[PDB]
């Protein structure tokens, strides 16, 4: 540490490089979820699949 | 840009006009210029100036 710099709070001392994950599937995953529920509803005659709480 | 009259009229609705609840962008307000009129040379030309 030097000059006006705040003390750090990082935890990258453990071997994080094989414990890290980056999401590149997001929008396609969202599309897949939409497709899955749409297919399910349609299969059920188009009848509601929704749950009343 | 080549517009349909349909498109041109819809555009006007979208960014505020008629206040259409689903077509309008939710409580959106268009930006305004810092300079009211960019003809600076007309300001220079003016009698007061």
């Amino acid at each position: 540490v030097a000059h006006n710099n705040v003390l750090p709070n990082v935890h990258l001392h453990k071997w994080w490089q094989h414990r890290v994950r980056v999401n590149f599937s997001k929008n396609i995953k969202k599309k897949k979820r939409r497709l899955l529920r749409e297919k399910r509803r349609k299969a059920n005659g188009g009848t509601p699949i929704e749950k009343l709480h | 840009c080549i517009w349909s009259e349909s498109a041109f009229k819809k555009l006007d609705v979208i960014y505020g006009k008629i206040h259409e609840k689903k077509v309008t962008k939710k409580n959106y307000i268009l930006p305004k210029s810092i300079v009211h009129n960019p003809d600076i040379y007309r300001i220079i030309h003016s009698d007061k100036v």
Binding site: - | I2, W3, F8, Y15, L30
Partner: protein
């Protein structure tokens, strides 16, 4: 070694995004700008088409 850790994307902000679209549409409006952009405007018969 290159890794997928790389900050490829960016958050582009909603108000900024809207402003860019609106301002680009306004710019598209301007006849002088259309020609400057390289569109062959000579035989066109209105400022927005």
């Amino acid at each position: 070694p290159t890794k997928i850790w790389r900050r490829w994307g960016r958050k582009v902000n909603l108000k900024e995004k809207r402003y860019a679209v609106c301002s680009s549409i306004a710019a598209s409006g301007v006849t002088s700008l259309v020609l400057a952009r390289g569109h062959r405007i000579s035989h066109l018969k209105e400022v927005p088409l």
